[PDB]
Motif scaffolding. Sequence first.
Motif, short mmCIF file in Angstrom:
data_model
loop_
_atom_site.label_atom_id
_atom_site.label_comp_id
_atom_site.label_asym_id
_atom_site.label_seq_id
_atom_site.Cartn_x
_atom_site.Cartn_y
_atom_site.Cartn_z
N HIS A 14 30.96 98.02 9.28
CA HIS A 14 29.81 97.25 9.84
C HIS A 14 29.04 96.50 8.76
O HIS A 14 28.29 97.05 8.03
CB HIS A 14 28.73 97.99 11.02
CG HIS A 14 28.28 99.32 10.27
ND1 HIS A 14 27.07 99.34 9.69
CD2 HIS A 14 28.87 100.50 10.01
CE1 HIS A 14 26.97 100.47 9.17
NE2 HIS A 14 28.02 101.40 9.34
N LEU A 15 29.00 95.11 8.59
CA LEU A 15 28.46 94.16 7.88
C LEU A 15 27.39 93.22 8.43
O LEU A 15 27.46 92.93 9.54
CB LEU A 15 29.74 93.46 7.01
CG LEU A 15 30.66 93.95 6.31
CD1 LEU A 15 31.95 93.21 5.73
CD2 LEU A 15 30.42 95.25 5.13
N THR A 16 26.54 93.03 7.80
CA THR A 16 25.39 91.99 8.07
C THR A 16 25.38 90.71 7.44
O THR A 16 26.02 90.48 6.14
CB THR A 16 23.91 92.60 8.12
OG1 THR A 16 23.76 93.02 6.68
CG2 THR A 16 23.86 94.10 8.77
N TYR A 17 25.14 89.63 8.02
CA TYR A 17 24.87 88.30 7.33
C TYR A 17 23.60 87.62 7.52
O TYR A 17 23.02 87.97 8.90
CB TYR A 17 26.08 87.46 7.59
CG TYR A 17 26.23 87.02 9.12
CD1 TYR A 17 26.50 87.85 10.23
CD2 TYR A 17 25.67 85.68 9.51
CE1 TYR A 17 26.58 87.25 11.49
CE2 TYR A 17 25.73 85.16 10.69
CZ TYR A 17 26.19 86.05 11.76
OH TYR A 17 26.20 85.62 12.84
N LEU A 39 33.54 83.53 11.09
CA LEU A 39 33.46 85.10 10.88
C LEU A 39 34.39 85.73 11.91
O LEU A 39 34.96 86.67 11.56
CB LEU A 39 32.13 85.55 10.98
CG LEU A 39 30.92 85.35 9.98
CD1 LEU A 39 29.72 85.47 10.29
CD2 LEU A 39 31.56 86.33 8.78
N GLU A 43 37.07 88.75 12.19
CA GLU A 43 36.86 89.98 12.78
C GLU A 43 38.05 90.29 13.76
O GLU A 43 38.51 91.44 14.15
CB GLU A 43 35.55 89.70 13.40
CG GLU A 43 34.76 90.83 14.33
CD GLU A 43 33.69 90.44 14.90
OE1 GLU A 43 32.57 90.36 14.44
OE2 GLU A 43 33.78 90.16 16.05
N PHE A 50 30.93 92.29 12.43
CA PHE A 50 29.67 91.32 11.56
C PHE A 50 28.37 91.30 12.52
O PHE A 50 28.45 91.17 14.09
CB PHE A 50 29.96 89.63 11.31
CG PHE A 50 31.14 89.99 10.32
CD1 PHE A 50 30.95 90.25 9.22
CD2 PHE A 50 32.34 89.60 10.82
CE1 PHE A 50 32.01 90.36 8.15
CE2 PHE A 50 33.34 89.66 9.91
CZ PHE A 50 33.18 90.08 8.60
N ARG A 52 24.16 89.56 12.78
CA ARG A 52 23.24 88.83 12.07
C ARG A 52 21.72 89.33 11.70
O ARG A 52 21.15 90.00 12.80
CB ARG A 52 22.96 87.36 12.85
CG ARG A 52 21.99 86.27 12.34
CD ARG A 52 22.43 84.93 13.22
NE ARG A 52 21.65 84.15 12.48
CZ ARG A 52 21.97 82.84 12.81
NH1 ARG A 52 22.44 82.12 13.90
NH2 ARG A 52 20.88 81.71 12.32
#
Length: 165
Positions: A14-17, A39, A43, A50, A52
């Motif tokens: 689980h990544l954030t941007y 993105l 995915e 992803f 935000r």
Amino acid sequence: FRTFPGIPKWRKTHLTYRIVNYTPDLPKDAVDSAVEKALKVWEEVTPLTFSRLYEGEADIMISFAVREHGDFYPFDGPGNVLAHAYAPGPGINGDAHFDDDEQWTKDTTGTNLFLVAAHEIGHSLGLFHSANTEALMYPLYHSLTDLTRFRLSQDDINGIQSLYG
Ligand SMILES: CNC(=O)[C@H](Cc1c(F)c(F)c(F)c(F)c1F)NC(=O)Nc1nnc(S)s1
Ligand SMILES: [Ca+2]
Ligand SMILES: [Ca+2]
Ligand SMILES: [Ca+2]
Ligand SMILES: [Zn+2]
Ligand SMILES: [Zn+2]
Ligand SMILES: [Zn+2]
């Protein structure tokens, strides 16, 4: 396909941007959408997701800049280098920077933001350059890709599955 030396990769799913600032070249809305579409391409073919952020430090920080901007690799003005992204890891790792001396468009003729962003995130996830001419990761992808027919190649898919499954 090729990976970076030592095979760096993300250790969570689980990544954030965060989009830090905006180009004068397009409207804000047009920028958010080029980035979200880039993105989603990745995915769809990995078990990553992803989300935000609007404050704080996110895993992938996206920003626009010219010439010197805080790292070892200064932008070069109009043409030549268009952008640069770092391989997975803490701090500057994973981040993407776009040269604001280029003219960012939504067109099929000219420097397209969505196209370049989909290639740079490939770097941010762990992929280096391919030798397959049809790949999103071949170095001349920006001149050769027909945006009406956009699709990841089998080589792109093979490469990302070897890291993430
Ligand atoms: C673990 N190695 C990396 O993360 C390298 C570090 C690095 C730079 F970021 C850089 F700008 C540069 F000029 C280098 F020479 C360099 F070695 N990252 C990439 O090559 N990113 C790229 N983004 N877009 C491309 S087209 S290639
Ligand atoms: Ca980072
Ligand atoms: Ca440039
Ligand atoms: Ca510009
Ligand atoms: Zn977790
Ligand atoms: Zn930079
Ligand atoms: Zn590249």
